[PDB]
Every structure is written in structure tokens, then in C-alpha cells.
Ligand binder design. Sequence first.
Ligand SMILES: CNC[C@H](O)c1ccc(O)c(O)c1
Lengths: 232, 212, 54, 338, 244
Amino acid sequence: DVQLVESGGGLVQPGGSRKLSCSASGFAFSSFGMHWVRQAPEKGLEWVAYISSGSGTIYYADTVKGRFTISRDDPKNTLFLQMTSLRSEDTAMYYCVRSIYYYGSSPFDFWGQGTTLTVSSDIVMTQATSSVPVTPGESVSISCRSSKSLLHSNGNTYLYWFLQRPGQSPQLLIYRMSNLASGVPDRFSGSGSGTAFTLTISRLEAEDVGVYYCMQHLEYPLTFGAGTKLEL
Amino acid sequence: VSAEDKAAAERSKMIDKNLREDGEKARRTLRLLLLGADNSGKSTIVKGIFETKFQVDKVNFHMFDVGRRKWIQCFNDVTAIIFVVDSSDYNRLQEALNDFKSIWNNRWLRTISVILFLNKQDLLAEKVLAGKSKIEDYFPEFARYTTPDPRVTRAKYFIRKEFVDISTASGDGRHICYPHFTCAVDTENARRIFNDCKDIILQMNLREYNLV
Amino acid sequence: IAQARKLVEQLKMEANIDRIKVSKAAADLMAYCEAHAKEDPLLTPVPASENPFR
Amino acid sequence: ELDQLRQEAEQLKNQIRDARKACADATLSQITNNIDPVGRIQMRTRRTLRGHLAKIYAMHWGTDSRLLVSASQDGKLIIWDSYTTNKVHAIPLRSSWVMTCAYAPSGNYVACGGLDNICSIYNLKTREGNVRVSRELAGHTGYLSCCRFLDDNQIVTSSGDTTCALWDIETGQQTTTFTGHTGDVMSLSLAPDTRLFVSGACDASAKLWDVREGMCRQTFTGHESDINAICFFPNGNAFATGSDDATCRLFDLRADQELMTYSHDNIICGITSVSFSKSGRLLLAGYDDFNCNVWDALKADRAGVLAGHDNRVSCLGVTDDGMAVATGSWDSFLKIWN
Amino acid sequence: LGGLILFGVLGNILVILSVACHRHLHSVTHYYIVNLAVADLLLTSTVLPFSAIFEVLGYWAFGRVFCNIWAAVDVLCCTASIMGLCIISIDRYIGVSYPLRYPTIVTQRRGLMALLCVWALSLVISIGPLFGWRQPAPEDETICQINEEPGYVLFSALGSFYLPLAIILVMYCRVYVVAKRESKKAAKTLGIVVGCFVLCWLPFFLVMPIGSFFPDFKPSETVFKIVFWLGYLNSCINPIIYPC
Ligand SMILES: CNC[C@H](O)c1ccc(O)c(O)c1
């Protein structure tokens, strides 16, 4: 049903320009906030940009602020990222991420496909674990830490857990540190307090191996953690 | 406030904008409540709940007919009530008068004017020309009534006078019935509705501006 | 004809419902009201900090 | 035969009345005459929810007591976040005339209905991100005046055709039809145990219905006009009705009689909405004279007034946790009180 | 003195509050009513105490730098009030002469345009004295006087009273003709509105130009002060008479 396709990518000489397209199909693109999030070839995910519903609010990451422009065409259901003066550090895999915002919403629920692009203070999230070898059927945990407390005055702790299987786009597992995303097995659970969170899984099954990212959404920028890895 | 509770406010503002646009669109259409009874000819006045829309002089009118003590309060804000009546018969004419009296003195319809539509006047003319059925038999005051074929005009004026006399009881001027005569093959009903609605809106505006 | 039979059958069925004393009913109603007097934010003035609506 | 059946029915009614009077030794006023009085209660408008451009007809709180829903004659079903007064959703309606709305206990569905004689059920949680219509329950031959969710696939609807209906949202057909009313069924109120409910009709009659058995069990009278609103007591063994005769009545399921009458000689306007507090000590009687009243359910005395509406009050609801009270009105403004 | 100013401020505040207490104030006519109420409240709360203290003490207190603006805020607010009356009359005329086409003629995205044009014209007229179009300021800042430059006098007087007066008269005469066509009470209300506008604003806009262009026919100072306070009286009166 819901499907986001991406076009563009390829090789760009340094300092060039590139227009990345994200075509949505199967959902109300007008009412969904959109994000561009990049992942380095051998590192974690980096948030690039965010545009609200109706283009009424736009934020950029400090790295690409001023050099990147984000836009959306609602009648055509398209999301555009215009990139100019591409440095050699901007090569990454870009994902256009839907996220809707209301009481009880699940931001970052569906992540589009990936577009490769090869170029020739902030709340920092810490993922102490780098790789945790585990056996199927054994309950394990992933620990994440925040520089600042993510518990808000409204009782909402804006922490998100994302899973990336080898060769697969990320998907939302747990949003706001306690709630479970739809379509995710009830094995996963999230707990913890400010600056100290734990994603505990019980009876780990197959295809659960992959990278796990803890992202903060208290303020901007959206700083992902280093992200742990579960392998057999 | 955080991004989660601020993008929510932005979404709320977008929803407010859409609501304002829809309300502005809806304010340009006049809502008419089409009432009446069975075999009163309400089906062919203008060429669950049923709704119809027709445009005259670049003005769109919506008429709603349902097919009434309770749900009538849902139509408290309609511009006008098109009350269709079949004057051809006489036995059910008193029933129609009672219905009109009930509608006029309704608690939730005390500020709505009624565009009365005396339908099928041609059959009334045929019945009064034949002479088989006498109105005086049903309405004893008809014999003592005279006009202000001439007999057809006297009967029509009598029916209108009876309806208007019912209307003027405790009217206080907040709403006035607008009688009309319409036959089955009539096609000028839209213009009559247009003129009646124009007069109703003009009177409402004059009342609002603290004038007469 | 069957409508009257259905009505009288319904009345006969309803007539056999056991009715307790009004005093016991009122007593248990008052007991439920008083047992939750500490859980009613409307009855007792809600503290400003505890009130979600400022 | 007809005369014999009429005589038998009259004798049965007389015996039922005699049995009810035999179970009436004391009065609720006498029982609670020694109770501590509520005193003076002054709830103030904490939030005002603007955005409607027509008269509001129905409003139902969510289970979490944060979200709420409202229906207006402008074809809009608006789901509000009462905490921050943000419109979570705005659903256009196929029929602009809506007299009822409901919020599913799971929070996944909402319901609406009215003069179109169709109960539209909308699925809030969707992949597409917009509120689409999940089901269109059809079969009533009159306008729907109230509807309440039992589960995600079981809803009780009251229509103007003198019949209520327990439906099956999965298949869209009436699992059970509750017949026995002689007039339009204005309101229905589910019981906390969800095994029984009540329905007030225009014949000044409140009928108790067993959902599982699908047959009426008790009938309560004592009102002089149409019953507009009805609400179950939190305990589940009582309920209260509001009627056009400017009186509110308290009935007990076990006692099967009218216990307390909340009315004042000053008030002459009919009641349009009634709801109970979490403890049941307060009865919130919404009137059509632009203001609501608070009644001590055990003293039958007015506790306070809630004024601030410029038009008729149509719907009134109390949060499940008892935090606040939503009161809608015909002036397109629904307020929150605490 | 200050009592009338306080009464006018209270009336304008009450009108502003009532313009938002009920949802019936959604039509453009209520927007114009609240615009007039805002203009009158701003005029009062920004000029009436200053005018009162100037009349009582008899000399400028805040200084010529802080009294030159008092000769521009006052004209801005008075012009805003008069143009609000004019736009209210225009709205009433277009509503009466085109009853069922009123929503499709007077629409939001157009009434807001009219309101913003009214305020823009008011500020354009008020900027005159601050654009150098004023009489040579006296050296002694203890004395603060209005500007009687003939060009500014003609421009301000015309574009603040005479054109609005002409439009008001034309629109209200057409409204009266239409109302009499559809049938005393309307006559009384329209006449009292027009008379209360004219008897309050015409005296000032007649005594000022006569002193500006005909110093021989220049009136006294007491009558000048009476005409000066007539505008404030009209500002206080407007929220009393226009809603009802
Ligand atoms: C009551 N205040 C009137 C104001 O001082 C004023 C307004 C317009 C003018 O043209 C003018 O010369 C003076």
C-alpha cells in the first residue's frame, strides 16, 4: 500500500548540484511531514532535513544548512531535495521518511527506499554497545544514553528505536520510549528514564539480526545514536 | 514545546484553514426545507433524507425533503421552508391547515419564513368548474366569502385568505408566509423561490442593521 | 392481533422481576458515592499542579 | 379476545405498580437527609475549542480522557486534543445532518449518524494516514439519535424508528433488533459491565435492554414529555434521564422505580444532555437555556451553574477519569470545565 | 474631562469583548464593527489622557519630540474611525441593495483587503506631519500646536472627512430609499446615526479650514477646543450607537 520511491543518486563531482526526488503513493502525502535522513556507507544514520505539512516549517541539519533546499509538490505527490556544493563528506544513502504529528501519532513510521549519492547544543545519543552476539530465543537488551534528559514537562519522552536489517531500509520499532509501532511483534519492549534507555527483546527470532538505532526527537537536530548491532 | 507538540499545532492550523475555507464555501448557498404531505405534489415543484440543488441567477439553492416533531429542530437555521399544499381536494385541506399551524407555531421555527406553494391549482379550477364538490360543504364560511372564471378566483382567494389568517395569528412580524399558486406544468417556481428568498434575506439584513 | 399477545407476554415476563427495597438501593448508591469521594476531581477542588488543564 | 387481552394487560400493569409501591417504604431524600452536603462548586472554563462553523450536536470523550470527538451540522466530525486544544482530525461527512457521534473504547474507530439513516463508522488508525469510512451500517428506517461502541466490532445504535439495534461492524448487519418503543429513541446509555444498556424514547419511557438476550427487561415511566438524554450511573445499578418537562429523574434497576427528581420551579426549559461524574455525586444536566446545572445526586439540590454558551447546549460528556467535562452547544463552541 | 474618556474606553472595550464572546460575529459586518471599536479604543487610550493633561496644565509636558507624534497618532486614529464608519456604511449598502448576493460580493479575502486599505490610508494621511509637512515648530517646547500648513490642511481635511462624508451620505441615502421601498423606525435610526456623525465631525472640519485659509474669519479658541473634543465625543459615542 504505502510506497515511497526515490530517484536521483549516482556519482556527483565535488561542488556539483543534484536534485533528489521522492514520489509517494498510497497515502495522503499532503498531511504527512517529510524528512530526509542520510546514512553513511559504514556509519549510523544522519538526519538531513525536515519539511512540515504544507511547507509551513522547514529545518536543516547544521552540516547541510544553506547548501540544501527541501520542497514538496502536493498535487504531484513529490518531495524534492536540491543539493548544491556537495562536499566529499555528503556521500551517503538518503531515505525520505514520512512522519505525521498528532496526539498518539507514530512519527518515522514508514521509511522510503534508498538513494545512493557518491561525491568524488545538539543532544548527542550514545550507544556504548557496538556489536552484541546473541543466540535465538534468548532475551537481550540494547542500552542507549542521552546527553540531556528526554523527559518533557508533558510526560512524553521522545525516544525512538529503529531497526535496519542487512540490505533493508529502516523501520520504526518503538516510538516515545514506551509505545510499540504497529506491525512489530510484541517481543520488543522499551523502558528507562531520562538519559538512560533500554530496548529489551525476548525470544529473539530469525531475521531479527541487524542494526538498532536510538534517535532523539526532543528538539532539532534529530541526532541518531551510534546504534548497536545484533548478529548470530 | 518540542517538535512533537509544535508540528501538532501546525497541523491544527492547517485544519483550521481548511475549515474556514469550507465554511466560507457553505455560507454562499441557501438551505431550503421542503415540507408538505403525501400526494401534495412536492415531487415536481422545481424542474433517508433527500437533497436537491438548483442554480438560478448564479445563486445555488439547496432543498431538503425528509421522508416531524423532533428532527425539525435540526433545520433551525434554514433560510426558508417551502410548504407545498395540494388545494385540489377539500377533505384533507383542513389537515394541511393543521400541519401549517403546527409548523408555524413551532418552538424551533419561530424566525423562519414559509414559502407556501398552493400546488395543483389547475385541478382546483377543474373541480370548482365541474361543481360536483362544493367548498361550502367542507368550509361553511365559503358561502359568506366573496372575492375582494370568477368562482375560481374566489376559491383561490379564500384558500389564500385562510392560510394567511392562520399565519398572522401571533406572528409578531418575525416571519411572514409567502403564498403562491403553482400548477403541475408550471416552470416559474424557481423564480418565485428566488424572489421570496431575496425578500427574506433583505428583511433579515434590515433587522440586523437595527432598521425597520 | 399478535401485537397484543406479544405485549401481554412482555408484561408478564417483566412482572416477575424481583424488586429489592428502595432503602437498600439508596443505601448502596450512597455507599458507592461516598467510597469514591476521593477519586472525584470535580467534587473536590483539584490541585493546580495535578490538573492537566492548567 | 382483544378486550380480554386489554383487561389482562391492565391487570398486569396494576399489579406491577402495586409491587413497585410495596417496594417503596422510604425515600432517597430521607435516606441521604443526614449526609454531608456538596456545598458550592464553581467549575471554570479551562479550555475553549473553537473551529466549528455550525451548530454542534454530539460529543463523546475518549477512554484516555485526552482526545474527544464532536459532530457539527457543517458536515464536520472534529477530533480534538483537549489538552492543547489542537484539532487532531477533521473528517468531512457524507451527510451534513448529524445528530450523534461515538468514540470507540480502543480509540481506533469513531461513529456518526443522523437524518441520513446511515451509521457511518470511520477507522482512525490507517496506513494511508487519512480518516476513511470503515463501515456504513444501514437498515434503520429513521434518523439515528444516539450510538455507542461496545467493542471494535459491536455497536448499539438508537434510531427514530422506535427500534434500537446491536450491529456487527465486521459484517454490517444487525445482530439484534431491540423493539418495544412507541416513539423515537432519543438516547441510549451503555452500562459499565457492557451486558445491559438503556434507551429513552419520546413516549416518556426508559427501557432496559439485555445485549446478550436481545430482549427488554424493565420499563421505567414517570416523565411528562420526551426523554432527550439518558446516562447510566457509574455503579451500573442506576441511571438518570433528562426530559423536555424540565425535570431529571433517577431510576434504579434493582428498585425499578423513580428515586429522585431534580427540578426547580424557576427552570422551564427541557434537558438536552445528561452525564454523571466518576463518583456519581454530581449529575450534570445540560439545558437548552444556554447553561448547564450541577445537581447533588443524593440531595436533589442544585450545586452550581455552568454558563458561557450563547446558544442551546446539545451534548455534555464527562471524562472517564473524571478530570474534566466537555459541554458543546449550538453556537459552534464546546467548552471544557474543571 | 477624564470621565468621558474613561466611559468611551470602557464602551470600546466592552464592544471588543462582545465581538469575540459569541460565534455570531463571523460575518464581515462584525469585522468592521470590531475594527471601528479597536480604532476608537486606541484613539481614547492613546490620546485622551494626553489631550486632557494638555488642556489642564496648558503647556506641553512630554516635549516637542514626544508631542509631534501626539499630533500624528490623533489624526491617524480619527481618520481610522471615520474610514471605519465609511466602510460600515458601504457594507450596509451592499448588503441591502444586493441581499442574496452579499456573501458572493462581500467575501473574506476582500473585506480584509478593504480593512487593510482603510488602515493604510489612515497611516498615509497621518505620516504627513512626520514627513516634514508641518508648520515650523516653535523653539519653546513648552508650547505644542497643531500644524496648519495649507497643503496638509486641505489633504487631511478632505481625505479624512469630506470624501468619507460623501460616501456615507450616498450609501445611507440609497439604503434609506431601499428601506422605504420595502417599508419611521428605519428613518429614526439612519437619521440619528448620520446626525451624530455630522454634528460631531463637521464642526471641527469647518472651524479648522476656516482658520487655515481665512484668518479674518478664524474663530476663537474655546470653540476650537470644543470642536477638538467633539471628535473624541464621537469616538466615545460610536460603540454605543452602532451595535444597536
Ligand atoms: C479630534 N482630533 C482631530 C485631529 O486632531 C485631526 C484629524 C484630522 C485632521 O485633518 C486634523 O487637522 C486634525
